[PDB]
Design a protein around this ligand. Structure first.
Ligand code: MG
Ligand code: MG
Ligand code: MG
Ligand code: MG
Ligand code: MG
Ligand code: MG
Ligand code: MG
Ligand code: MG
Ligand code: MG
Ligand code: MG
Ligand code: MG
Ligand code: MG
Ligand code: MG
Ligand code: MG
Ligand code: MG
Ligand code: MG
Ligand code: MG
Ligand code: MG
Ligand code: MG
Ligand code: MG
Ligand code: MG
Ligand code: MG
Ligand code: MG
Ligand code: MG
Ligand code: MG
Ligand code: MG
Ligand code: MG
Ligand code: MG
Ligand code: MG
Ligand code: MG
Ligand code: MG
Ligand code: MG
Ligand code: MG
Ligand code: MG
Ligand code: MG
Ligand code: MG
Ligand code: MG
Ligand code: MG
Ligand code: MG
Ligand code: MG
Ligand code: MG
Ligand code: MG
Ligand code: MG
Ligand code: MG
Ligand code: MG
Ligand code: MG
Ligand code: MG
Ligand code: MG
Ligand code: MG
Ligand code: MG
Ligand code: MG
Ligand code: MG
Ligand code: MG
Ligand code: MG
Ligand code: MG
Ligand code: MG
Ligand code: MG
Ligand code: MG
Ligand code: MG
Ligand code: MG
Ligand code: MG
Ligand code: MG
Ligand code: MG
Ligand code: MG
Ligand code: MG
Ligand code: MG
Ligand code: MG
Ligand code: MG
Ligand code: MG
Ligand code: MG
Ligand code: MG
Ligand code: MG
Ligand code: MG
Ligand code: MG
Ligand code: MG
Ligand code: MG
Ligand code: MG
Ligand code: MG
Ligand code: MG
Ligand code: MG
Ligand code: MG
Ligand code: MG
Ligand code: MG
Ligand code: MG
Ligand code: MG
Ligand code: MG
Ligand code: MG
Ligand code: MG
Ligand code: MG
Ligand code: MG
Ligand code: MG
Ligand code: MG
Ligand code: MG
Ligand code: MG
Ligand code: MG
Ligand code: MG
Ligand code: MG
Ligand code: MG
Ligand code: MG
Ligand code: MG
Ligand code: MG
Ligand code: MG
Ligand code: MG
Ligand code: MG
Ligand code: MG
Ligand code: MG
Ligand code: MG
Ligand code: MG
Ligand code: MG
Ligand code: MG
Ligand code: MG
Ligand code: MG
Ligand code: MG
Ligand code: MG
Ligand code: MG
Ligand code: MG
Ligand code: MG
Ligand code: MG
Ligand code: MG
Ligand code: MG
Ligand code: MG
Ligand code: MG
Ligand code: MG
Ligand code: MG
Ligand code: MG
Ligand code: MG
Ligand code: MG
Ligand code: MG
Ligand code: MG
Ligand code: MG
Ligand code: MG
Ligand code: MG
Ligand code: MG
Ligand code: MG
Ligand code: MG
Ligand code: MG
Ligand code: MG
Ligand code: MG
Ligand code: MG
Lengths: 49, 272
RNA sequence: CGAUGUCGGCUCGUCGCAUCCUGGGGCUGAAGAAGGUCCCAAGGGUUGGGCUGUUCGCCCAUUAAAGCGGCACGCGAGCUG
RNA sequence: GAAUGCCGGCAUGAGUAACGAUAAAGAGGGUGAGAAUCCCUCUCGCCGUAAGCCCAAGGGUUCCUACGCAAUGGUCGUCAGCGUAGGGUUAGGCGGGACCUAAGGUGAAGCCGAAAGGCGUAGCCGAAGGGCAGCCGGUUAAUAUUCCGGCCCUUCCCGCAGGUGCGAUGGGGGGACGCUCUAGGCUAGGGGGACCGGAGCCAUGGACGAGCCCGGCCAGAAGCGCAGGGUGGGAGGUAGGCAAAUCCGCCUCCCAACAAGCUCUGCGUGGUGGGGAAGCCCGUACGGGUGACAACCCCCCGAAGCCAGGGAGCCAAGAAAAGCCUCUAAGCACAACCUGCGGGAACCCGUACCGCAAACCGACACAGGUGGGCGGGUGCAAGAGCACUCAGGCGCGCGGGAGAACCCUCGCCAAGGAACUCUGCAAGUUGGCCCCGUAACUUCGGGAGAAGGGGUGCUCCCUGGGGUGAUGAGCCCCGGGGAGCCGCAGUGAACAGGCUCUGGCGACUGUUUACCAAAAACACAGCUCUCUGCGAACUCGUAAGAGGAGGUAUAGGGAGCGACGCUUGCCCGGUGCCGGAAGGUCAAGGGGAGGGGUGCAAGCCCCGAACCGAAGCCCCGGUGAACGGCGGCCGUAACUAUAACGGUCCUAAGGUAGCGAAAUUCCUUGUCGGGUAAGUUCCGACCUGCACGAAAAGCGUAACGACCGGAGCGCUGUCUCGGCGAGGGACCCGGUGAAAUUGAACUGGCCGUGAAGAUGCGGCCUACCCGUGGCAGGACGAAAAGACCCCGUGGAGCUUUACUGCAGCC
RNA sequence: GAGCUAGCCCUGGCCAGGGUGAAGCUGGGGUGAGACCCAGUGGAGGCCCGAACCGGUGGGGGAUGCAAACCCCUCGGAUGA
RNA sequence: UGGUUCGUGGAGCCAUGGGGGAAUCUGGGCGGACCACCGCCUAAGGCUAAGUACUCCGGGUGACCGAUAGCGCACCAGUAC
RNA sequence: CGCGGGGUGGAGCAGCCUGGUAGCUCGUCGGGCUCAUAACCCGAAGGUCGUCGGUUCAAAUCCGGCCCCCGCAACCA
RNA sequence: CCGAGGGUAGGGCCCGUGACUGGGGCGAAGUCGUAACAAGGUAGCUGUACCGGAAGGUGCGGCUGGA
RNA sequence: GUGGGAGAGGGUGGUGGAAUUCCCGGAGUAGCGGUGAAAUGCGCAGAUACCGGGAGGAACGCCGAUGGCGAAGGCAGCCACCUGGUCCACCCGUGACGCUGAGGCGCGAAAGCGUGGGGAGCAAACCGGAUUAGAUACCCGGGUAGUCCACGCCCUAAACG
């Protein structure tokens, strides 16, 4: 059947990107938490040009 | 007149379509004056706030003239009468000698080629606009302003009118389509005649689809729902209500008057 | 009750006997034929259809007879639902 | 030592199940330490509106090559999408960005909000939509519309040359638009040819023949030619297009009424550039040479594509902005802009490869899902259908045998035809086309494919229309009549309704429990009530604000009923809602009669009665397509029987019509009648309606239903009642190799006993040790800390005239 | 968190081939003029048969599956809500 | 209405959102309703070290652990997945 | 089986809960109006209060046991 | 070839019969009421419409077969 | 044909006053309505009676007649428009062109039906209050269709002289 993962580079970027997270206090805290944690990747790596 | 069909299909046996014979050879509209992009959307910034809206034909807005006092004294020739997707009535395309082209909402009896004009001057004829004062008591009228210089707001639906009843210092009394008795300021413009397309009420949609074409989504009964959804939801195999009938939001829907009492508008109203 | 699947049907059965049939027998208000009733006897047999989910039962047409009950109302790690 | 404890390790089932589609394999030769599995050749089979080909998303080295096989591959592996390394992605014209705007997002102005923040006209961001200049070949092992070859373009910048008042983010025009049906001419694509080109070939009885087989094109500037799209030209007047305007708009006169003329596309042609089969020889994994100076011509079918803003009809009335044309304002007119020709300038990012899939989404080389374009040939009425087949791509990454039970899938049957079963569930009969011919009823459309019939191949003769062609031959579609031939059978294979009668419910097409319910449920047009005068009512939000709606009573919100026909009776006592400037009560406040506490007092400080005090409640009416409700007991007619009539008690009023053992009937298989040999169902009645009944609508209704019941016909393996055959497993051999379960085990029957159902206790009976295929009675077999039931002063969801608050409205 | 699913907004795309033959238009008839009736044309429709595509009706298989919704036969819709 | 031990209590003091609304030393607040007395302070403007908190970081010590412990990580771990 | 309502003149109903009196309509019987009947008018009659038991000074009335009558209930399996 | 007739299938008319049901008719002395005939005690009749145990009543309009 | 005459003949539009009912303002009390008699009902929440304004619908007093017109049904304030039938005179024109009339077609009171209006009065049904043995009637107080308009059906009658 159709499963739940339907990859889209634009969606992933607009949805979970560094700039989206930065836009709101909710998201800014996510970066803070991930930084303090020592996460190698703050936001998902969306590729291609 | 109303177009009628034979039952060559079920739902074609009741279906019924407007007569478009008053639609003069001018079916597609007029750029310049109108159209605008019209912005379909069944809801506010976010959430739906009027249920069951959506779908249905794309539209172009015809930006019509609801304040006729710009062109006081300037007459215009009625050039055409065309279909307007965004109202019950039809619209008149008129050419002002000025050059300017406006649309007026098209009254009953309006003929193409006719002369029409607005102002204190203005022969009392179908199509003309006047401040309510100079209009003879008892004449039927439409596109009436509520307060002066604020635009036509009463009687624009197809086949509607108001009748002038009497006067009272600065106000003339109106009898509105609903039957209400209203004091409306003398200085309010209103155009003589009834609205026309009066056979609009006689049309039978005929099937579900037609409803959808006009963007009317299926309306579901409270009875059909559940207690979470509606006061009428549940219980077992059908149910008669079990309380005084209500809206989904709990207010009673048979009888409960809802106009706020202390409206300052009150001292200008005399009926139902 | 940290699970003993619950009606009926189907399939496969097996057992009890307080025997429906057939075998033996006493009494009969048993002439004979056919019955009634009781005793001995389970070796084998104990039909096909209509309605009902039905068990049971009421019918239809037969038959030697169309027996009753136990087996977790026998049998769902065999089927049906 | 126990926690269905936690982590780790190793067992058991077990050499068991399986090895992922039943599209299919055989052989010969290579290479190698090692071949069913790799490379090659011959044969066989499968897809072919794909299982072929090209894009888009996603993927991100998987692409190419050399070297390798420990792991990854459901077996093997010399092979690989795997390991090591090295290569490989070339753009002014293809796509995206130095262009535009949509929803939406952002947001200077502004508004709002405890803070975080929320709205937000302008502007900006935002794309498969708009705009925009490259076509055909050739080369690499791997890239090419990117490199190269030919032919053809677009921008800027700088020149000269010639024109003109040039000139804005501003005015106007255009861009610019729906659905269905379509005309004319074109191309793509295809079929035919006795014509042209070509290696070759006479086979096995015949054929050296208009014999067989193969191929007969592609791009192409200007200029033409055929199609076809766009558009009227002047002169005045002007108050509108938010400054201006010669532009546009409007009024008035002339000339055209036409595509005549200008343009703008498409298509044919075109200077010239390229391609070019079979077969044969070769050594490649694969391609090369020759065939070739290849030929490159004529007919025919013909689009859904092009001309494209084509036309016709319809209602539901079908983006925006820029590019482009124009008009003028600031300004400038030694500027500038337009046109012609030259030279120069022309960046950034993507490009490999997979891509209906072993490279994407499903943990897997997963029988699943995944948007667009092409998708040939014959035959079948047509077609993207179906059977075979081009090109092209595969044989589905474990094999070999055997020929039991049993399972799955399939084929056939004597005789009977539903006796099967909850039920004809399943399977069968039917089946395409043409022609005859079709009932009740009906909303006059339908019912209708009703039902029931016949025809269907090949051959020869005569013969009617068109289409392309000149009015002709041919080529191509539709037809008619007449003789005859063959078989069991002519839509000879494949795709392709079984039919009727009669009830229930729902009118109808629709919709729904993604993953057990598709229905009689939801929706539906339509009907009625009800609120709403517009800063509407209602909804979201603390607000600002937005939806409603750029709508205005023929309109919008809420409720219910649910096409249509005939209809919807009585009760306002209670509850709701509606209407009532009286009255009663009623909080804060007003008011202070009177009293209290302190002071030597002036004073300061407390309570406090009349009386004035709102909505609300009470009170007075109305309102049932508002919440709802719509009786009991005795008697009576000149056969009995029954009760039109009556008495009496109560009510707010006492169930009308129309239905009725029903989706409603307990007693119940009610009671007659009909279908049957037989009928707890079904159908027609009766009415004693436990417990119908009129908008939670009443009784009907043509048509419609993968709904539900009853019946008959046809036909059958459903059954009497089975039998045989096929294939994939099962079984045996080689290869890989799981699982839940498991206190331990050396794990028999009976009759007892035991926590009351014993392999394990007692007695007796039986029984040598160990396996393999099978059947499931049992281990109260596995699986889930029972779903039901109860418990816990456990939890949630729901309701209301439970309590208490809150929003909201007054 | 709406890359599954639900609705709506913006912008594009898809639906082979067959049947049936509404209005309308034309001619004819009819009348004082009509309605109306015949043909012919015409190509309507939540119209019909049926691929794609979208569904998920009945039966069987699958049940440590190919698959945590599949497969086969059969079936509904297929210019529209 | 909040704060304080103070939950309306005899409920003050301190703070306030709403209404009313002064005085400048013979002026005002306070000492638990209120009043008298006797006393204490001097509102409606601001700044002010030190003693106090913490431990990402460096240093010392341990009747603290010793790779199922000790931080999740002694090991390229906030990694693989 | 459970629960709660009811048996009062011939008929249908009050009368109970706050014990002492049995009342209403109809019917019936006698008289009148009428030719006659009904209607109407004037008088009258009629009740072991379901039975058993006692509580009381005293029971239709209060409390028990039975007896018919009526309505409700009987759910989860 | 045709053809009596047989078979199949679907119709049209007619007759017989059918639980139950609608009204009709006739039947010496049954129940209920008083509609009409005298102004029949509400003048009657009427077409239609609704309502009612029954005759019937009422609404609308008409008639002289009444004043 | 020429020339005139009467008429509620028909259709459409417009308009006038009287009267009822409701609304508001005034003034004003203790009852009004209604019947054979009463009651229901309305009225101290301010009725009835009277005055002033407003709205709305329907019907047209006197003229009016025992009258006129029409083919019948039917037709009544006034105005204008559109239109039918009809009679008198003059004896001018055509010149037998005539009568009836199965069927057909058209009209057709009221009631009723469909769709949308409008709704003052009256008023089937229905609800009360009286009357009665009982009244689903006659009387009274309420009151929905309908009565009115438009269009479309219905085709009946003591459509009667
Ligand atoms: Mg525009
Ligand atoms: Mg919002
Ligand atoms: Mg938002
Ligand atoms: Mg609904
Ligand atoms: Mg529900
Ligand atoms: Mg609720
Ligand atoms: Mg129910
Ligand atoms: Mg409810
Ligand atoms: Mg248990
Ligand atoms: Mg257990
Ligand atoms: Mg014995
Ligand atoms: Mg004997
Ligand atoms: Mg059965
Ligand atoms: Mg049993
Ligand atoms: Mg037995
Ligand atoms: Mg038992
Ligand atoms: Mg059992
Ligand atoms: Mg078992
Ligand atoms: Mg079941
Ligand atoms: Mg222990
Ligand atoms: Mg373990
Ligand atoms: Mg095993
Ligand atoms: Mg085995
Ligand atoms: Mg095996
Ligand atoms: Mg790699
Ligand atoms: Mg190699
Ligand atoms: Mg391997
Ligand atoms: Mg490779
Ligand atoms: Mg590699
Ligand atoms: Mg740049
Ligand atoms: Mg941009
Ligand atoms: Mg925008
Ligand atoms: Mg924002
Ligand atoms: Mg932009
Ligand atoms: Mg773009
Ligand atoms: Mg481009
Ligand atoms: Mg390549
Ligand atoms: Mg411009
Ligand atoms: Mg522009
Ligand atoms: Mg030979
Ligand atoms: Mg060319
Ligand atoms: Mg200007
Ligand atoms: Mg070659
Ligand atoms: Mg066009
Ligand atoms: Mg712009
Ligand atoms: Mg210019
Ligand atoms: Mg590339
Ligand atoms: Mg490529
Ligand atoms: Mg594809
Ligand atoms: Mg594989
Ligand atoms: Mg694998
Ligand atoms: Mg796959
Ligand atoms: Mg697909
Ligand atoms: Mg094709
Ligand atoms: Mg073909
Ligand atoms: Mg075909
Ligand atoms: Mg195919
Ligand atoms: Mg395989
Ligand atoms: Mg057989
Ligand atoms: Mg046979
Ligand atoms: Mg048969
Ligand atoms: Mg049977
Ligand atoms: Mg049986
Ligand atoms: Mg059946
Ligand atoms: Mg079947
Ligand atoms: Mg049926
Ligand atoms: Mg049926
Ligand atoms: Mg349905
Ligand atoms: Mg679905
Ligand atoms: Mg489901
Ligand atoms: Mg279905
Ligand atoms: Mg309806
Ligand atoms: Mg708004
Ligand atoms: Mg709006
Ligand atoms: Mg409404
Ligand atoms: Mg409903
Ligand atoms: Mg319903
Ligand atoms: Mg009702
Ligand atoms: Mg009530
Ligand atoms: Mg009341
Ligand atoms: Mg009430
Ligand atoms: Mg009230
Ligand atoms: Mg009050
Ligand atoms: Mg019955
Ligand atoms: Mg019932
Ligand atoms: Mg029978
Ligand atoms: Mg029977
Ligand atoms: Mg019901
Ligand atoms: Mg109801
Ligand atoms: Mg219904
Ligand atoms: Mg359907
Ligand atoms: Mg049968
Ligand atoms: Mg079989
Ligand atoms: Mg086999
Ligand atoms: Mg093996
Ligand atoms: Mg042993
Ligand atoms: Mg035992
Ligand atoms: Mg032992
Ligand atoms: Mg033992
Ligand atoms: Mg076992
Ligand atoms: Mg087994
Ligand atoms: Mg078991
Ligand atoms: Mg178990
Ligand atoms: Mg438990
Ligand atoms: Mg339970
Ligand atoms: Mg408790
Ligand atoms: Mg036609
Ligand atoms: Mg069509
Ligand atoms: Mg369809
Ligand atoms: Mg179909
Ligand atoms: Mg299903
Ligand atoms: Mg406090
Ligand atoms: Mg203070
Ligand atoms: Mg103080
Ligand atoms: Mg102090
Ligand atoms: Mg003190
Ligand atoms: Mg400080
Ligand atoms: Mg550790
Ligand atoms: Mg260690
Ligand atoms: Mg650790
Ligand atoms: Mg007497
Ligand atoms: Mg008969
Ligand atoms: Mg009879
Ligand atoms: Mg009598
Ligand atoms: Mg009489
Ligand atoms: Mg009389
Ligand atoms: Mg009458
Ligand atoms: Mg009456
Ligand atoms: Mg007054
Ligand atoms: Mg005249
Ligand atoms: Mg003469
Ligand atoms: Mg005649
Ligand atoms: Mg009539
Ligand atoms: Mg009438
Ligand atoms: Mg009616
Ligand atoms: Mg009517
Ligand atoms: Mg009245
Ligand atoms: Mg009356
Ligand atoms: Mg009387």
């Amino acid at each position: 059947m159709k499963r739940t993962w339907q990859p889209n580079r634009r969606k992933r970027a607009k949805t979970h990107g560094f700039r989206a997270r930065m836009r709101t206090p909710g998201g800014r805290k996510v970066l803070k938490r991930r930084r303090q944690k020592g996460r190698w990747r703050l936001t998902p790596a969306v590729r291609k040009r | 007149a109303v177009k009628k069909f034979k039952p060559y299909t079920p739902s074609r046996r009741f279906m019924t379509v407007a007569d478009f014979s008053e639609i003069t050879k001018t079916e597609p509209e007029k750029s310049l004056v109108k159209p605008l992009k019209k912005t379909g959307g069944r809801n506010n910034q976010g959430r739906i706030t009027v249920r069951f809206r959506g779908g249905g034909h794309k539209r172009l807005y015809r930006i019509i003239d609801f304040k006729r006092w710009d062109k006081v004294g300037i007459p215009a020739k009625v050039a055409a009468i065309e279909y307007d997707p965004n109202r019950s009535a039809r619209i008149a395309l008129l050419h002002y000698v000025d050059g300017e082209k406006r649309y007026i909402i098209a009254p009953d009896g309006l003929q193409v080629g006719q002369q029409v004009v607005a102002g204190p001057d203005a022969p009392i004829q179908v199509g003309n606009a006047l401040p309510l004062r100079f209009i003879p008591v008892g004449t039927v009228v439409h596109a009436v302003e509520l307060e002066p210089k604020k635009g036509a707001k009463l009687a624009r639906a197809a086949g509607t009118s108001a009748q002038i009843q009497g006067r009272e210092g600065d106000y003339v009394i109106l009898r509105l389509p609903s039957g209400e008795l209203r004091k409306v300021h003398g200085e309010c413009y209103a155009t003589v005649g009834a609205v026309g397309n009066a056979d609009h009420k006689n049309i039978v949609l005929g099937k579900a689809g037609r409803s959808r074409w006009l963007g009317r989504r299926p309306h579901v009964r409270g009875a059909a729902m559940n207690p979470v959804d509606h006061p009428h939801g549940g219980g077992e195999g059908r149910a008669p209500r079990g309380r005084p009938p209500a809206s989904p939001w709990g207010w009673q829907t048979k009888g409960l008057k809802t106009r706020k009492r202390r409206k300052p508008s009150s001292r200008f109203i005399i009926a139902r």
